[PDB]
């Protein structure tokens, strides 16, 4: 039941002391270059999932494999649209699904959780209505080992509700918010100490 | 969202400075003719609903009507099981349903909302599983001006988190927690500040 701080730069390694886990976005900066003692997630986000990696699957996995060797991460984040052959990293896996256009229906997200290759499933989808909160609460009500929350300014609170429905993680920002609705490490810690 | 502090003694009146609204519980303290300048709810809670008013509805309503006259409250809390004619108070009415044993299925709770007499409906039911969180979230998703949360220690988070689905109110304790799972005025304001 942990705070995950997403890091985008070397500046940000110092800002993450309150975090349990740290997410190393190697599409944003090469963390391969220095040692991170904290529990860590290796991610290389494709452009099509709001990241900065713009290149084919081949160069992306090669870059992730070389970073995996030198960081020895606790998790790798791999995407739900990849085939089973790609889930070949020797650690726990976060299998993620991103949607910046919409929250799919319950039926559609249930297929992702149920077809899981990863140790944890992560779902992060654009909130456009309160029915989408419903979709995500159902999913967490019905499955375990799932991080599911809604993105967008209006849906910030779902980041925290999810932990209370069994999500192992709350993802937080360090420095500045990288997108609308993101919650600071300080804020998240305050909120959860208050709620219990 | 407004924060409501439930007052049970004259000491607690001095403690509600950061509440938007105070709920005067006259089954526990004769608030009758108390100078309260803040938005207020008059409530006289039956033992069967977890308070300490015993004997007649005749006695209880007489008690409430006299308390109305002196206090001039903004709302009155009237229970959902009362016939239409009880709703003869000249102010806004919060119609409420308490279940200390159970959170009913969605269809039963929907009936209470659509069969409403009051301006607001309040649903406070004993949380027994995560499925109960989803019931209460469907209700808030499908209806406006409803306060719905789960009672009990394991489901505190719903008292704050569930109000982000359009509830007018968060109910807060002041001084000591009156029931297990209750959220303090302080913690409620801080989470609300930090969430956005």
From Swiss-Prot, chains A, B:
Domain of life (superkingdom)? Archaea
Provide the protein name: 3-dehydroquinate dehydratase
Q: Which family does it belong to?
A: Belongs to the type-I 3-dehydroquinase family.
Pathway recorded for this protein:
Metabolic intermediate biosynthesis; chorismate biosynthesis; chorismate from D-erythrose 4-phosphate and phosphoenolpyruvate: step 3/7
Q: Which gene encodes it?
A: aroD
**Catalytic residues (positions):** 98, 122
This entry's Enzyme Commission designation comes to 4.2.1.10
Q: Which sites bind 3-dehydroquinate?
A: 23-25, 45, 159, 182
Q: How does it assemble?
A: Homodimer.
Q: One biological process GO term for this chain? A: aromatic amino acid family biosynthetic process
Which keywords appear in this protein's UniProt record, sorted alphabetically? Amino-acid biosynthesis, Aromatic amino acid biosynthesis, Lyase, Schiff base
Q: What class of enzyme is it?
A: lyase
Sorted alphabetically, which InterPro entries does this protein's record hold? Aldolase_TIM, DHquinase_I, Type-I_3-dehydroquinase
Entry's Pfam families? DHquinase_I
Q: What function is annotated for this protein?
A: Involved in the third step of the chorismate pathway, which leads to the biosynthesis of aromatic amino acids. Catalyzes the cis-dehydration of 3-dehydroquinate (DHQ) and introduces the first double bond of the aromatic ring to yield 3-dehydroshikimate.
């Amino acid at each position: 039941m942990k705070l995950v701080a997403t890091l985008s730069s070397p500046e940000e390694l110092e800002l993450a002391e309150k975090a349990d886990v740290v997410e190393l976005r190697i599409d944003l900066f090469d963390f391969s270059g220095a040692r991170v003692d904290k529990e860590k997630i290796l991610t290389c986000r494709r452009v099509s999932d709001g990241g900065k990696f713009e290149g084919d699957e081949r160069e992306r996995i090669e870059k992730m494999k070389r970073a995996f060797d030198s960081l020895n991460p606790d998790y790798v984040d791999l995407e739900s649209d990849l085939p089973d052959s790609a889930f070949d990293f020797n650690c726990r896996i976060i299998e993620s699904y991103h949607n910046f256009i919409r929250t799919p229906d319950y039926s559609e997200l249930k297929g992702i959780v149920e077809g899981r290759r990863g140790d944890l499933v992560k779902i992060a989808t654009m909130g456009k209505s309160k029915r989408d909160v419903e979709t995500i609460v159902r999913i967490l009500t019905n499955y375990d080992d799932v991080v599911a929350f809604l993105m967008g300014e209006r849906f910030s609170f779902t980041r925290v509700l999810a932990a209370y429905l069994g999500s192992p993680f709350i993802y937080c920002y360090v420095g500045s918010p990288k997108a609308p609705g993101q919650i600071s490490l300080d804020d998240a810690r305050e909120i959860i100490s208050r709620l219990g």
